[PDB]
């Protein structure tokens, strides 16, 4: 029970059945609905199109005090409660934070810097990294890191995988595993294509594997009392963080995840304002990143970052490819062709999960061969996931802020990070060198 619909508030308005990419909700034009939790793909977008908000001025329902216990939210938020509710993880994070024994480390996703500022009565899509890191340090967090380290790591891994696979072509139309909902859907309906999906882990799991093994040696702490919490803008990472095949060194790479709304609730409970907070910086050993890792929030950013280094790995000499405009969009299926290394690439990206089913078919993929296709279950990338707050019913402001943050940095190619060079020199050696295959990869074999 993660994505549930309360039956004392739902009026059967059926508006949440028009955006579900699986049709996991069963009901009628009237009467309360119900979620088929055995087929649900956990996209989280049936939450932001719900508007039954039944108030507590009547005693015909629960008294709005036990409801916050069931939802798992904090007891001092007093926000309106809807019907299709996400499960809460704030109480466990607060209780773990109150413990002064566990070394605490938190991870920031590349959409928290543009979404949380709307929770405190500011402009829509305001880039405040320094205020965010200052608040996270003021939350009694011992270490704060950016998951963009794992983003650059998985870009390098995906580029190396593409260069390896283009030679001796074997499952050439591969897909990326950045979106756990897509992997869940592939397990659901197409078990015969579990080998097409690339074996790269998500950047969150990249940083989770790095912290528990490499991060224990950069400091003087044993890798057993470390407590890792990741702030991801999606209801999509909770299922990825507790799979039995998604751990290394015996311990979970990340303990539990919280959406942006939960972090805002924690900040409100701590009673600290946001405008007064000064500007700070992240921890240098595991928080340095380049511009290419910043645009994972918007669609087409993963493909752009992968291309920015695959081009160099293919032609071995620099050609300016920082700016690309044929892979930008917000709806439908986007495609482009790139001529590099005397080879043509018919690259494409898909917005939504229902849109990829046409070109996923084994006969439709046999005409263009679809050299590189990534996936985002929520439309317009992760910036419209279940973690982002409601808008009381836009999306362009956050992606424009992310693009401006990308353009304002002095590093564009996802290889100039000194942290990556140091990590390769000290810990991993070479990519895909029997050490990356243990920590940086996983095998998708449910076959259910």
């Amino acid at each position: 029970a993660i994505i549930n619909i309360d039956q004392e508030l739902c009026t059967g308005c059926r508006r949440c059945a028009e955006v579900c990419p699986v049709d996991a909700i069963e009901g009628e034009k009237g009467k309360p609905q119900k979620i088929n939790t055995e087929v649900c793909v956990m996209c989280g977008q049936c939450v932001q199109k719900c508007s039954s908000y039944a108030s507590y001025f009547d005693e015909s329902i629960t008294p709005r005090n036990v409801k916050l216990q069931e939802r798992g939210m904090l007891d001092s938020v007093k926000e309106p409660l809807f019907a299709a509710y996400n499960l809460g993880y704030a109480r466990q994070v607060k209780e773990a934070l109150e413990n002064p024994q566990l070394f605490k480390v938190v991870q920031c996703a590349p959409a928290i810097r543009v979404s949380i500022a709307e929770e405190f009565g500011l402009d829509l899509g305001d880039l405040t990294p320094g205020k965010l890191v200052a608040a996270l340090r003021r939350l009694n967090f011992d270490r704060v890191y950016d998951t963009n380290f794992g983003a650059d790591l998985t870009i390098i891994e995906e580029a190396n995988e593409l260069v390896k696979r283009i030679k001796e072509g074997k499952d050439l139309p591969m897909f990326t595993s950045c979106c756990p909902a897509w992997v869940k859907f592939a397990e659901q309906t197409y078990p015969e294509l579990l080998k097409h999906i690339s074996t790269c882990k998500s950047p969150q799991q990249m940083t989770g594997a790095i912290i528990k093994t490499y991060g224990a040696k950069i400091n003087n702490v044993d890798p057993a009392k470390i407590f890792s919490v990741s702030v991801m803008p999606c209801t999509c990472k909770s299922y990825e963080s507790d799979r039995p095949e998604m751990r290394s060194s015996g311990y979970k790479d990340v303990d539990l995840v919280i959406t942006t709304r939960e972090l805002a609730h924690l900040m409100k409970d701590k009673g600290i304002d946001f405008a007064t907070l000064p500007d700070e910086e992240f921890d240098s050993p595991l928080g340095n990143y380049t511009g290419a890792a910043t645009i994972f929030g918007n669609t087409g950013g993963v493909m752009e970052a992968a291309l920015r280094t695959a081009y160099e790995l293919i032609t071995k000499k620099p050609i300016p490819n920082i700016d690309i405009e044929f892979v930008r969009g917000g709806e439908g299926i986007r495609t482009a062709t790139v001529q590099v290394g005397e080879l043509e690439l018919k690259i494409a990206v898909v917005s939504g999960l229902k849109n990829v089913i046409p070109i996923l078919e084994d006969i439709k993929k046999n005409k263009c061969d679809l050299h590189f296709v990534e996936v985002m279950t929520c439309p317009e990338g992760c910036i419209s996931g279940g973690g982002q707050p409601k808008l009381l019913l836009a999306y362009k402001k956050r992606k424009e802020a992310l693009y401006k943050h990308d353009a304002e940095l002095e590093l564009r190619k996802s290889h100039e990070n000194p942290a990556i060079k140091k990590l390769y020199e000290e810990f991993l050696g070479e990519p895909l060198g029997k050490q990356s295959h243990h920590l940086l990869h996983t095998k998708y074999t449910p076959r259910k």
């Binding site: 309106p80 500011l122 808008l391 009381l392």
Partner: protein, 183 residues
């Protein structure tokens, strides 16, 4: 002096999504720190139109803005006045004398606590704790702000702002064309 408009529902194209009340609550409470985002709402929610569901479907009901309004006449203090084209309650002078709830036959007025600057508003001398001030809430047809917000937020486009003068002319012309084509 001319007829006042009033919003009316449409039971054929209403579902019961409650997405028209939230827009009203968000547009009226701009002084209680709302930023069109759930999470900045630190106050309980109070709409103006009320959705009612029965065997023959569901629809919202609200104030019809009567001309010889019973609610305005029974109010001894003088809170309810026809300030603009529509009929509006005044929050400064209301004392909660519940005669309004015995006047309006539709029931578009509800007594709820006031919330100003994001906090509950208390009284001077009552009970030993304090007690909140109770005000009458009803539709004011968004006279202070722009066009109505319950419309432009209905996904099915069911709510309509009807002026009772043009509708009569349209119905008259329809009847005249229907009868004159047969004789």
């Amino acid at each position: 002096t001319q007829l006042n408009p009033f919003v009316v529902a449409n039971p054929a194209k209403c579902i019961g999504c409650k997405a028209c009340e939230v827009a009203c609550f968000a547009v009226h409470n701009r002084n209680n720190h709302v930023g069109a985002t759930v999470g900045t709402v630190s106050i309980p929610v109070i709409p103006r139109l009320h959705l009612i569901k029965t065997e023959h479907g569901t629809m919202p009901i609200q104030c019809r803005h009567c001309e010889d309004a019973p609610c305005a006449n029974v109010c001894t203090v003088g809170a309810i006045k026809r300030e603009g084209n529509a009929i509006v309650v005044d929050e400064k002078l209301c004392i909660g004398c519940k005669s309004c709830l015995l006047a309006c036959p539709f029931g578009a007025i509800e007594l709820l606590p006031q919330y100003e600057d994001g906090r509950e508003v208390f009284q001077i001398n009552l009970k030993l704790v304090q007690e909140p001030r109770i005000i009458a809430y009803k539709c004011d047809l968004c006279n202070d702000l722009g066009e109505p917000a319950c419309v432009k937020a209905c996904p099915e486009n069911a709510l309509t702002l009807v002026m009772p003068t043009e509708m009569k002319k349209a119905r008259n012309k329809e009847a005249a064309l229907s009868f004159l084509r047969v004789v």
